[PDB]
Design a protein around this nucleic acid. Structure first.
Ligand code: ZN
Length: 461
RNA sequence: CCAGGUCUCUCGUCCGG
């Protein structure tokens, strides 16, 4: 990522755009029942909690471009990854405007609850206005595509979401790029059969977890991994992706049959964003509010890792690589042990900031007792050891419960957190129900019992 | 009165076969 210029958008004929300026998070019934260190993220420049300049902070992530050329380790990685995907027999055809708009097997419909973005947003126009799920009417969309085309600017927003104390003071509020309806539709027409293939095949062939259900997948994962685990964190993954990675991606796409629409990837790489009263231009990087980001980022991870293993270990057989990524998040295995500090080493040379997994001070052996994926741990059931619980820690569930975006949701919300928390075990789950019930509104809530949740789990297998 | 992206999973409401 790398800004290439800002400037009042007035002098370039673009609309001013009024971001909402107030959080929607409000303390919960359970704010004082449970402890927690997190709070709403900074939404504006004029925020009392700020120990630093906002805009400087939120635009700090665009760090520059280490490389641009696809060297020969990347090339082999590309070759190896593309060959795996080839075994999925992915339909390489354009998706029709109807499926792209309304969904097919393996691809949901466009979210009607969200913005349609530029320019529809400066026209007071909405997705619901354009799209009809019932009739599956395409006439209106096609006219808007014909009229406004593709490759439109994005609209920058700051995400309203809980954030820790130090990220509040540091103004590390995260940013959002409202992709345009036109571009979502074009991206799904081109890539829809790709996204569908990935959603239908979470596992070690796609090397992606998109489409999985942790409650069930977790029992599948250890059997898919090779003997020895390794993993690490990135710092600013999207921001740190240099053009070379996007070329390598394009190469994978040519290799599995999407040659004709890799130009869509370039378009993603040069993008104009309108934030508030100005307008910038990033070169490199992929906006996160774009279609397929989630899948493309998982794809890049698979290349990034392959690249580093080939560079670091002479004669490593990639055929014994087993990894599953969900964007930057990854869990990886190999029949003999690999040193992620050494992997993090070579990653320095590609713009990649790789730190011990799980905020640890040091790189340490990754074990089935310490590895985490999608924020959850792995723990065999006590009675059926082949069945593995995805264990999210109560700390996180505690953070969530102390807040709400509408108290009308308390029952749905809390009940959802129970489906996460019982994996921590009967003694810890019951404690949870204690506290929730320690206040009156809690005792209004119908909450499942450990045994109900447990039977449901065993049955779901 | 609204206003804030892409996705996945699940749950709930409701409604169908
Ligand atoms: Zn530009």
């Amino acid at each position: 990522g790398e800004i290439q210029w800002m400037r009042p958008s007035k002098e370039v004929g673009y609309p001013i755009i009024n971001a909402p300026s107030k959080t929607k998070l409000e303390p919960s019934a359970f704010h004082y029942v449970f402890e927690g260190v997190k709070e709403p993220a900074v939404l504006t420049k004029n925020d009392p909690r700020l120990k630093t300049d906002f805009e400087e902070a939120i635009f700090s992530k665009y760090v520059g471009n280490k490389i641009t050329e696809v060297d020969e380790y990347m090339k082999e990685a590309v070759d190896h990854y593309a060959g795996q995907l080839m075994s999925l027999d992915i339909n390489t055809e354009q998706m029709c405007l109807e499926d792209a708009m309304y969904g097919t097997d393996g691809l949901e419909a466009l979210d009607l609850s969200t913005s349609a973005g530029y320019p529809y947003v400066a026209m007071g126009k909405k997705k619901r206005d354009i799209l009809n799920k019932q009739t599956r009417d395409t006439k209106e969309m096609q006219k808007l595509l014909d009229t406004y085309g593709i490759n439109l600017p994005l609209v920058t927003y700051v995400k309203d979401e809980l954030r820790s104390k130090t990220k509040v003071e540091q103004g590390k509020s995260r940013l959002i790029e409202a992709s345009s309806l036109n571009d979502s539709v074009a991206m799904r027409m081109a890539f829809g059969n790709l996204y569908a293939a990935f959603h239908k095949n979470p596992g070690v062939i796609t090397g992606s977890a998109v489409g999985c259900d942790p409650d069930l997948f977790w029992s599948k994962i250890p059997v898919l991994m090779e003997e020895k685990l390794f993993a690490f964190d990135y710092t600013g993954y999207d921001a740190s992706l240099s053009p070379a990675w996007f070329e390598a991606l394009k190469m994978v796409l040519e290799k599995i049959g999407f040659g004709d629409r890799v130009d869509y990837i370039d378009y993603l790489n040069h993008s104009h964003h309108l934030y508030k009263n100005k307008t910038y231009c990033v070169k490199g990087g992929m906006p996160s509010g774009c279609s397929g980001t989630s899948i493309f980022n998982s794809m890049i991870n698979n290349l990034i890792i392959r690249t580093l293993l080939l560079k670091t270990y002479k004669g490593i057989d990639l055929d014994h690589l087993k990894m599953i990524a969900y964007g930057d998040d990854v869990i990886a295995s190999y029949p003999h042990e690999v040193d992620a500090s050494l992997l993090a080493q070579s990653g320095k040379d590609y713009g990649l900031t790789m730190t011990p997994a799980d905020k640890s001070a040091t790189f340490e052996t990754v074990t089935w007792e310490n590895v985490t994926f999608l924020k959850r741990f792995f723990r065999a059931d006590e009675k059926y050891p082949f069945l593995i619980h995805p264990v999210m820690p109560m700390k996180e569930i505690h953070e969530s419960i102390r807040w709400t975006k509408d108290p009308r949701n308390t029952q749905d919300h809390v009940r959802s957190l129970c489906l996460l928390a019982w994996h921590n075990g009967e003694e810890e789950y019951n404690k949870f129900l204690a506290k929730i019930r320690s206040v009156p509104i809690g005792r209004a809530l119908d909450l499942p019992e450990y045994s109900t949740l447990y039977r449901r789990w065993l049955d779901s297998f």
